[PDB]
Design a protein around this motif. Sequence first.
Motif, PDB file in Angstrom:
ATOM      1  N   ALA F 112       6.170  -1.572 -13.570  1.00  0.00           N
ATOM      2  CA  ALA F 112       5.274  -1.084 -12.516  1.00  0.00           C
ATOM      3  C   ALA F 112       5.956  -0.263 -11.421  1.00  0.00           C
ATOM      4  CB  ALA F 112       4.520  -2.250 -11.895  1.00  0.00           C
ATOM      5  N   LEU F 113       6.952  -0.852 -10.758  1.00  0.00           N
ATOM      6  CA  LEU F 113       7.634  -0.184  -9.639  1.00  0.00           C
ATOM      7  C   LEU F 113       8.802   0.714 -10.064  1.00  0.00           C
ATOM      8  CD1 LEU F 113       7.787  -2.791  -6.707  1.00  0.00           C
ATOM      9  CD2 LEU F 113       6.109  -0.984  -7.031  1.00  0.00           C
ATOM     10  N   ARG F 114       9.046   0.847 -11.369  1.00  0.00           N
ATOM     11  CA  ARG F 114      10.054   1.794 -11.866  1.00  0.00           C
ATOM     12  C   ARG F 114       9.540   3.238 -11.796  1.00  0.00           C
ATOM     13  NH1 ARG F 114      13.085  -2.150 -14.761  1.00  0.00           N
ATOM     14  NH2 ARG F 114      11.726  -2.438 -16.591  1.00  0.00           N
ATOM     15  N   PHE F 115       9.226   3.685 -10.582  1.00  0.00           N
ATOM     16  CA  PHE F 115       8.827   5.064 -10.326  1.00  0.00           C
ATOM     17  C   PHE F 115       9.560   5.568  -9.090  1.00  0.00           C
ATOM     18  CE2 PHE F 115       6.158   4.817  -6.532  1.00  0.00           C
ATOM     19  CZ  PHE F 115       5.853   3.468  -6.470  1.00  0.00           C
ATOM     20  N   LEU F 118      13.459   7.001 -14.453  1.00  0.00           N
ATOM     21  CA  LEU F 118      12.191   6.472 -13.957  1.00  0.00           C
ATOM     22  C   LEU F 118      11.074   7.526 -13.963  1.00  0.00           C
ATOM     23  CD1 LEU F 118      12.671   7.825 -10.967  1.00  0.00           C
ATOM     24  CD2 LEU F 118      13.614   5.590 -10.394  1.00  0.00           C
ATOM     25  N   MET F 119       9.831   7.053 -14.049  1.00  0.00           N
ATOM     26  CA  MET F 119       8.655   7.930 -14.089  1.00  0.00           C
ATOM     27  C   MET F 119       8.295   8.458 -12.694  1.00  0.00           C
ATOM     28  SD  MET F 119       6.195   4.755 -15.031  1.00  0.00           S
ATOM     29  CE  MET F 119       5.808   3.483 -13.831  1.00  0.00           C
ATOM     30  N   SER F 120       7.379   9.426 -12.642  1.00  0.00           N
ATOM     31  CA  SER F 120       7.095  10.168 -11.404  1.00  0.00           C
ATOM     32  C   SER F 120       6.086   9.487 -10.480  1.00  0.00           C
ATOM     33  CB  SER F 120       6.601  11.582 -11.730  1.00  0.00           C
ATOM     34  OG  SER F 120       5.235  11.586 -12.109  1.00  0.00           O
ATOM     35  N   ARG F 121       5.247   8.618 -11.037  1.00  0.00           N
ATOM     36  CA  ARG F 121       4.208   7.943 -10.260  1.00  0.00           C
ATOM     37  C   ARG F 121       3.910   6.556 -10.823  1.00  0.00           C
ATOM     38  NH1 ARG F 121      -0.210   7.796 -13.378  1.00  0.00           N
ATOM     39  NH2 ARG F 121      -0.470   9.433 -14.967  1.00  0.00           N
ATOM     40  N   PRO F 122       3.288   5.680 -10.013  1.00  0.00           N
ATOM     41  CA  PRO F 122       2.878   4.380 -10.545  1.00  0.00           C
ATOM     42  C   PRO F 122       1.808   4.515 -11.626  1.00  0.00           C
ATOM     43  CG  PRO F 122       2.714   4.441  -8.130  1.00  0.00           C
ATOM     44  CD  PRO F 122       2.912   5.844  -8.598  1.00  0.00           C
ATOM     45  N   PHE F 123       1.542   3.426 -12.339  1.00  0.00           N
ATOM     46  CA  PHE F 123       0.455   3.407 -13.311  1.00  0.00           C
ATOM     47  C   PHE F 123      -0.879   3.409 -12.572  1.00  0.00           C
ATOM     48  CE2 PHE F 123       3.804   1.083 -15.805  1.00  0.00           C
ATOM     49  CZ  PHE F 123       4.011   2.089 -16.734  1.00  0.00           C
ATOM     50  N   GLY F 124      -1.866   4.091 -13.140  1.00  0.00           N
ATOM     51  CA  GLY F 124      -3.209   4.121 -12.567  1.00  0.00           C
ATOM     52  C   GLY F 124      -4.160   3.233 -13.339  1.00  0.00           C
ATOM     53  N   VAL F 125      -3.650   2.096 -13.807  1.00  0.00           N
ATOM     54  CA  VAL F 125      -4.432   1.182 -14.630  1.00  0.00           C
ATOM     55  C   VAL F 125      -4.044  -0.276 -14.361  1.00  0.00           C
ATOM     56  CG1 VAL F 125      -2.842   1.387 -16.604  1.00  0.00           C
ATOM     57  CG2 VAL F 125      -5.223   0.678 -16.988  1.00  0.00           C
ATOM     58  N   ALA F 126      -5.056  -1.134 -14.259  1.00  0.00           N
ATOM     59  CA  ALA F 126      -4.851  -2.574 -14.137  1.00  0.00           C
ATOM     60  C   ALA F 126      -5.096  -3.223 -15.490  1.00  0.00           C
ATOM     61  CB  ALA F 126      -5.792  -3.161 -13.097  1.00  0.00           C
ATOM     62  N   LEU F 127      -4.404  -4.330 -15.747  1.00  0.00           N
ATOM     63  CA  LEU F 127      -4.502  -5.026 -17.028  1.00  0.00           C
ATOM     64  C   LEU F 127      -4.879  -6.490 -16.848  1.00  0.00           C
ATOM     65  CD1 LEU F 127      -1.298  -3.697 -18.847  1.00  0.00           C
ATOM     66  CD2 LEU F 127      -3.620  -2.796 -19.037  1.00  0.00           C
ATOM     67  N   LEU F 128      -5.800  -6.958 -17.688  1.00  0.00           N
ATOM     68  CA  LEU F 128      -6.065  -8.382 -17.837  1.00  0.00           C
ATOM     69  C   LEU F 128      -5.372  -8.847 -19.109  1.00  0.00           C
ATOM     70  CD1 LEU F 128      -9.878  -8.562 -16.988  1.00  0.00           C
ATOM     71  CD2 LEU F 128      -7.994  -9.308 -15.525  1.00  0.00           C
TER      72      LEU F 128
ATOM     73  N   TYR G 118       3.226  14.060 -19.837  1.00  0.00           N
ATOM     74  CA  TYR G 118       3.357  15.157 -18.871  1.00  0.00           C
ATOM     75  C   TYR G 118       2.578  14.927 -17.560  1.00  0.00           C
ATOM     76  CZ  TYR G 118       6.000  18.296 -21.948  1.00  0.00           C
ATOM     77  OH  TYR G 118       6.977  18.869 -22.725  1.00  0.00           O
ATOM     78  N   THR G 119       1.799  13.844 -17.489  1.00  0.00           N
ATOM     79  CA  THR G 119       1.075  13.483 -16.263  1.00  0.00           C
ATOM     80  C   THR G 119       1.826  12.474 -15.387  1.00  0.00           C
ATOM     81  OG1 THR G 119      -0.213  11.658 -17.240  1.00  0.00           O
ATOM     82  CG2 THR G 119      -1.149  13.880 -17.389  1.00  0.00           C
ATOM     83  N   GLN G 120       2.857  11.822 -15.929  1.00  0.00           N
ATOM     84  CA  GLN G 120       3.735  10.982 -15.101  1.00  0.00           C
ATOM     85  C   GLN G 120       5.216  11.137 -15.444  1.00  0.00           C
ATOM     86  OE1 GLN G 120       3.102   6.699 -15.277  1.00  0.00           O
ATOM     87  NE2 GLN G 120       2.386   6.761 -17.409  1.00  0.00           N
ATOM     88  N   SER G 121       5.624  12.380 -15.689  1.00  0.00           N
ATOM     89  CA  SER G 121       7.034  12.733 -15.810  1.00  0.00           C
ATOM     90  C   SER G 121       7.406  13.668 -14.665  1.00  0.00           C
ATOM     91  CB  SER G 121       7.313  13.407 -17.152  1.00  0.00           C
ATOM     92  OG  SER G 121       7.225  12.474 -18.214  1.00  0.00           O
ATOM     93  N   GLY G 122       8.620  13.507 -14.148  1.00  0.00           N
ATOM     94  CA  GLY G 122       9.113  14.344 -13.063  1.00  0.00           C
ATOM     95  C   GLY G 122       9.433  15.753 -13.529  1.00  0.00           C
ATOM     96  N   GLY G 123       9.149  16.730 -12.673  1.00  0.00           N
ATOM     97  CA  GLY G 123       9.525  18.118 -12.921  1.00  0.00           C
ATOM     98  C   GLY G 123       8.645  18.889 -13.892  1.00  0.00           C
TER      99      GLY G 123
ATOM    100  N   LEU H  74       7.263  -7.925  -0.247  1.00  0.00           N
ATOM    101  CA  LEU H  74       7.131  -7.447  -1.625  1.00  0.00           C
ATOM    102  C   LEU H  74       7.875  -8.362  -2.601  1.00  0.00           C
ATOM    103  CD1 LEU H  74       7.386  -3.548  -1.350  1.00  0.00           C
ATOM    104  CD2 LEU H  74       5.494  -4.818  -2.365  1.00  0.00           C
ATOM    105  N   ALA H  75       7.112  -9.057  -3.443  1.00  0.00           N
ATOM    106  CA  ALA H  75       7.666 -10.019  -4.399  1.00  0.00           C
ATOM    107  C   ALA H  75       8.514  -9.380  -5.504  1.00  0.00           C
ATOM    108  CB  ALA H  75       6.551 -10.856  -5.010  1.00  0.00           C
ATOM    109  N   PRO H  76       8.112  -8.194  -6.003  1.00  0.00           N
ATOM    110  CA  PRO H  76       8.947  -7.523  -7.006  1.00  0.00           C
ATOM    111  C   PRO H  76      10.347  -7.175  -6.495  1.00  0.00           C
ATOM    112  CG  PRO H  76       6.754  -6.565  -6.970  1.00  0.00           C
ATOM    113  CD  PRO H  76       6.844  -7.472  -5.781  1.00  0.00           C
ATOM    114  N   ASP H  77      10.451  -6.810  -5.219  1.00  0.00           N
ATOM    115  CA  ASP H  77      11.748  -6.532  -4.596  1.00  0.00           C
ATOM    116  C   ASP H  77      12.601  -7.797  -4.495  1.00  0.00           C
ATOM    117  OD1 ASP H  77      10.834  -3.940  -4.393  1.00  0.00           O
ATOM    118  OD2 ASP H  77      10.988  -3.804  -2.211  1.00  0.00           O
ATOM    119  N   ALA H  78      11.956  -8.934  -4.237  1.00  0.00           N
ATOM    120  CA  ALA H  78      12.644 -10.228  -4.230  1.00  0.00           C
ATOM    121  C   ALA H  78      13.165 -10.574  -5.620  1.00  0.00           C
ATOM    122  CB  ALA H  78      11.717 -11.326  -3.731  1.00  0.00           C
TER     123      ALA H  78
END
Lengths: 244, 212, 233, 195, 222, 235, 240, 231
Positions: F112-115, F118-128, G118-123, H74-78
Amino acid sequence: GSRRYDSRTTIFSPEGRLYQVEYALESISHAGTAIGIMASDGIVLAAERKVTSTLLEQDTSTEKLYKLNDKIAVAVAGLTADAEILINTARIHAQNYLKTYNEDIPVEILVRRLSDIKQGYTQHGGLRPFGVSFIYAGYDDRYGYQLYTSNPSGNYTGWKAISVGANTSAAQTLLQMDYKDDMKVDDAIELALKTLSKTTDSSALTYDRLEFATIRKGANDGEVYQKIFKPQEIKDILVKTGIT
Amino acid sequence: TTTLAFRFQGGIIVAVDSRATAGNWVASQTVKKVIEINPFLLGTMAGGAADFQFWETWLGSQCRLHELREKERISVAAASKILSNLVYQYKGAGLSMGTMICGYTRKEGPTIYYVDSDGTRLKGDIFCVGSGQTFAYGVLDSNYKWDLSVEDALYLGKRSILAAAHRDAYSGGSVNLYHVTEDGWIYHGNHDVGELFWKVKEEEGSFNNVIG
Amino acid sequence: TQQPIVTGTSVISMKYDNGVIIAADNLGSYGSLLRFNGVERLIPVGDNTVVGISGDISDMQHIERLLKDLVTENAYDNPLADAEEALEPSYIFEYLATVMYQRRSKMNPLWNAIIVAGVQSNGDQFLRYVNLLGVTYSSPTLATGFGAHMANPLLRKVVDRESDIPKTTVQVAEEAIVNAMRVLYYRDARSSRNFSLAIIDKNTGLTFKKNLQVENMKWDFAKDIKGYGTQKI
Amino acid sequence: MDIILGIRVQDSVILASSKAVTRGISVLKDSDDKTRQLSPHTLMSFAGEAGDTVQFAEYIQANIQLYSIREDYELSPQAVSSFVRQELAKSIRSRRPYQVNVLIGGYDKKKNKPELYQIDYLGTKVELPYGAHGYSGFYTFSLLDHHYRPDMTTEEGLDLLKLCVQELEKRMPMDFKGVIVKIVDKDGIRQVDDF
Amino acid sequence: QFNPYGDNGGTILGIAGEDFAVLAGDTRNITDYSINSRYEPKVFDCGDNIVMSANGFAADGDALVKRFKNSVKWYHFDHNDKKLSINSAARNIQHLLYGKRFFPYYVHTIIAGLDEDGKGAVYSFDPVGSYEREQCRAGGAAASLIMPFLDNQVNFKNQYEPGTNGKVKKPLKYLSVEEVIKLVRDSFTSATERHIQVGDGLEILIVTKDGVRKEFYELKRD
Amino acid sequence: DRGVSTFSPEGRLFQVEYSLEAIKLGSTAIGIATKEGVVLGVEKRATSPLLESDSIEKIVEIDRHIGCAMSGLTADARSMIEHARTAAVTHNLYYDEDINVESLTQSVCDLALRFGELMSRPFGVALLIAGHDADDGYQLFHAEPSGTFYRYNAKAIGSGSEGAQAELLNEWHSSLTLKEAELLVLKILKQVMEEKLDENNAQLSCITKQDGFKIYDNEKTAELIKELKEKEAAE
Amino acid sequence: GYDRALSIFSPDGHIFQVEYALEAVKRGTCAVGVKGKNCVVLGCERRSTLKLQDTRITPSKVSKIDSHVVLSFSGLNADSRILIEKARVEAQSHRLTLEDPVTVEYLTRYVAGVQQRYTQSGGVRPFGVSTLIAGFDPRDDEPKLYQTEPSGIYSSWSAQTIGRNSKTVREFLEKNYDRKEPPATVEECVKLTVRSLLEVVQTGAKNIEITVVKPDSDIVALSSEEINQYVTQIEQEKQE
Amino acid sequence: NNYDGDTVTFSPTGRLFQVEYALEAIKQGSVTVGLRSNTHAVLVALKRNADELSSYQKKIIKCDEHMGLSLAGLAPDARVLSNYLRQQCNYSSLVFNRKLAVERAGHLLCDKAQKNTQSYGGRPYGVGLLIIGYDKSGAHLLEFQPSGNVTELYGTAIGARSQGAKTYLERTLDTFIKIDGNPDELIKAGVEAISQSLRDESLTVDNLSIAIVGKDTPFTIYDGEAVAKYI
Ligand SMILES: *[C@@](C)(CO)[C@](*)(O)[C@H](CC(C)C)NC(=O)[C@H](Cc1ccccc1)NC(=O)[C@H](CC(C)C)NC(=O)[C@H](CCc1ccccc1)NC(=O)CN1CCOCC1
Ligand SMILES: [Mg+2]
């Protein structure tokens, strides 16, 4: 950091256009007009040099027309420096194909790869696109004589007759008027010059302000010849059609 | 090792021995040489134990990921080729493998693929792999027909391993049988050579070379 | 892949009731040439540990620098560097043992056999061995090289098992070490007469003895030995 | 892998390839097809190191098929053979080279001519009227030197090929379990089932 | 040329009962013809009622045990303190061993404990990670001496019922912890007699539901 | 502009908060947990009648014992599912056992927070994420692009989430049967959906210890819809 | 390397760069896909502001990804080539490893996955392209038609259109296409496709391209005269 | 205002606004308390839920047998920082056969957080941590802030309304410090401390979270019915 100074060259507008590609096309529209006309027995390439100075060396000069290999040539419209970067890449690509398959590269394959390079600069890398539009004139044993054009977007299309650079709107109307399919090279030569003569921003069209080239099968038996016209040869062809 | 698998009228028979050796030292008599990859796929093991045990297990993980991604059970061809392409990457590094990917699918039917560590991949009806493969071939070939019954096919597979187990010093322990049908694989028991040899000798009247 | 050039021979050691003793001669051999004579092969770390090293001397000097640097690094941001959070023998050993095994695993070993002798904070005797291969073992008596073959037998007559350690005094233990060093001088062709000895006691602390010599040697019986069988003169 | 032959005649190219796959003291298989179709009018047979042969053949096959889709056009046999040669020429100076020898039989539709190329694992290409790899040549070449004519029919070429296989079956040490024969011509590629 | 491997000798032995399991191993450590230590333990409690020993090249043996012990620690951190089952430990060890397939740990690994049904379990590994559950396994220098004895006494191999004309086999049954320790002690005294790298002491680790107990016995020191 | 991993004055990450707004626009997904199993249901929401609704895949299998439903920018979920499946199978390879539902969820939430920049933005989706294991039994988790996950007895996500959650507050009890839970998901979905609920525009699924994760057929769900309507008219 | 996050969320929860990529698709020439009982037909608009064109060599709007699958698109022409190339490579890679050609769903899923990346890759910016992917699975006679878009979402359609004035032609297809009874023959399917394009195009001369795909790698493109016959027939029935 | 776009920018008065905004995320977090005597160290944490249907967010994490922390923000940071601590504790054990000092643990966390405040692209950690442990110099309690600042204390609290518990401990200092050899009484003092930060809500059985470490006590966490004793 450096975010502050980034122009973001590879983004969309709200209307779904690529800013930098559009502005690069605006740049090209001020460049000297280049015309390509495809006949049944050859292809003509004509191009107008940008406002010439009398002290410019004309005979040992190359601005518009470049040779990619023995069977393919290009007419340039835009930044010459940018075009040369792309031309050397295209020249190398042709030789890689020849080295690999022991056959001269088909025209479209060369055009596609060069256009794919341009496309890359519009989608990634954060660099400005190449401010260049090409007219490709060439021959291969699959499709015969072919005309293509490519632009900074990396989009390419095939043509029977086409113009790039300045006054393409007026130039395309005139070509659409007088062009027909059973046309010969010598007729196409006359059309190319007449079109430039009417669309030019200069007072009168002269030999020193032009670059000209033909791709005929006018060599001896089943082989293609590339003629890049000399100054005196342009002077003669201009008199022969009755422009000067 | 001695392992075999053959194709016939009623599906596929797969038979293996259970011995493991470190030179002339008999390390084990109870090794599983068939991998149950999924309910329709089997894999046989002849060569380096660790290599087989590690990579054919890994193969099963890749087959599971296929049916999750594609919502469909993997083909025998695709399964065997994952393994063959894997070992080909390690070609020259010293892996020792001769396996048989056996299974049934709708599109293929009953199928057997020989795969080994130098990258060979072969579709076929009959294969015998291992140090005692030639002994198994001798009995199997001379008695093989396509029209064998399920009962007779199981026995021939069992009898062929026994033949090798007897002659090959590096084969023995016990026989493990499997039958693969359109419905999947069915296990047909562990058969100790200790009891099986004498039982076969008496009932069949074979093995006259041995002191009865 | 190495080959050792300048080398140090046996390191010997044992446990006694209150602590540990360790010794090693002062020689740096260059093959058969007894090249260097002022080489200290016992290196103290703090006031509670002594590291005895045999094998390649260039690699020994590298290990010295590592230990020296370890003391410096431990003192950083550590108010209890000279108290509760001081370097223990077990910490120093495990560090070296880690390094030795990592280097053998990269096929570029530190060509040494090492014995870490010391006393822990709780008074317990520490004595453990490690070599170029990363092999480690502990025993009441420990020795490297020729010491393993000649010293251990003699030292094991004093302390043969665990229960013999409380029964062994520092006087008896040092006597056995000094005797072993004499025997090594008689029989090891890459040994010297001069050596160093170190005692780490839980009460009296670290005692480092330099410039010791092998003495009370038996050579007089040599005069009676003539020829190799039949000769009488 | 062992025996692969090729004969170019007036209007076609004929490839013959042994069916045996042997490993140690066991013939594992006697119906192996040592060839891949690269394009409708181009066929490649192969022989050499186990694993490398099929891996290389299928890799080439994929590349030629990719080209065909991209350009909606079939590459000439000459073009395909030059591509194959370059791949082998790269390979020989790699960390682990492909130890694969190939014959490429094709029918050039633009020239209306059959073409046979012989390429070894080093990347040594030659166009030939008849070709072979391995020990096969030591018997067949001399035989073909004698009996081969350039204006032969496909049927005459098959009889000429039978003569080669007979000689190999007589004088070769190993049992190669016969051959699969395939013909490449203007109408494409087809297999002779009874040989 | 530098040789990264060595042989530290010694021998180990694992036997499984109905509700228990033992893992024994001599305490002698050697190189060539010298004794390094008379008491250097090589059977370890690794937590979660799993005992382990990696016999052969001690440096590799220690490294492996150390890594597995650490693997157990991180299993707790990553999976809410879940107990690592013996079957799961075995599979994890395979990956530890096979991870160095092309520069192997020169060791013969044996682990012991209880399975998830509470029954005794022993797993044995080769140097590159192949593993198998067994009732019985000897490993190390004297494995070839001890193992055939175990086949005869634990699994009752080659033993038939008296008077049955060699037709009825001696029936398999679980051994008591008392009877197993007897076999272990006799196995090691016999091994000590006929193998030079085996002796000094014997350390046995017994594993029941209650925990991990230890027993030590003297062996001949020659 | 401004940094991607920037904090607001209130102490929240702008991009994470904005991604939550994208999830509110997404189609509804409901999950209910019981002692007999866990039920997962979603609104398909076809943009046009020509679109073949059976191709809309908003409920997904991760392993035999773990299922997953999604809401928001559903294209973003593909790599999350891919990671989850690999994580599940990889753990089985390393440990010869099923992986805990919580451990699986934690693995997904690590992405999730690997943006950033690393990827450019967070995910725009929630999961159950619903599943079962031997230790903690039947479980239901809500995995957000913030990297946080809560366990839930019942949970709704998407456009009709706040209304559906209030309904789940009243209706849920610890003795719910599986059949009761199935009807309850359908009932609440029909309440918050725009178009009228039927077997084609809504999908049910469940996970049980015995039969594992199963997506229901349109024939099976249609009968549960008919059974639901009859029971509401019966009082 | 150029790292900038170009595709990012806005306060209202939108990714404008993806949404602006859809506008590029809306600008593109109209493309339509209709699947019948035993076939799929892909129709494509070609704008007539370009005379003096050479139709022999000009890149065709419909592209073969494999012998059994085709791909048409609407949006940036240069962008489409990159997707088509990747798709063609993946098609051959699938045949190489699985020993079986791709399913239409698999190929679509791959292309859609590229678009999403390509919607969540940098550059990088998203592809300004939506695709219609159609064909038949190996050894299968059920027609397949899928759509993709810049965001990365994909789905199956009985019939669908994309590009400029696509909302008009979608309106047409929604009332003219019966789910219970799709176009039974090839002629019926092509006619409905041409009819739908005639709601938007202008003239039925060299403005409409039609490509028919049938089971077992049977793909053919119609010529001018063949298409013109459909145009002539429809107009005569209209005057009523 | 203009100087809060990223962490690499100083304000005219010398402030780092991104670090201050990260500090703000801690204030919004649920309260947690830390205190110690000479023999034991205790963590008490008020857990927070999304609603009645949800679980309660776990606040306490174990780092080693002798060390662990509680979190607020922030729990993920912890999770990232606790994982780093687990590795550092583990490195010390494998390489030096040495239990990591609680003081060094703090120094390592400080230096890890600092690097994120001086470089472009990255961001500060958005969480505060209370680290407890027992090592060779007795019991310890540390307070970590994502500015990098780490402080050793007898007692403290962080999170929303943490001032109430911090005032209480400041009064109770002389009493609870001498609770030696008595775990339950030290917890009672910690539970009474966190109670001074409660508003409208009280401590329930699935709400409270306690952890302890000491002389003959490994780091262990108590939840559920195991904390019913202290209500
Ligand atoms: C028949 C039975 C034998 O030909 C089969 O082929 C079986 C297949 C079954 C087991 C799946 N093969 C073996 O039993 C196989 C033979 C073999 C050995 C080594 C390389 C290739 C083939 N045996 C093994 O793999 C044994 C397994 C048992 C449990 C001991 N393992 C070993 O030989 C190991 C690991 C070998 C190895 C491979 C690659 C790198 C390093 C090592 N080696 C030892 O155990 C060494 N040996 C043990 C006794 O102590 C002295 C050293
Ligand atoms: Mg002796």
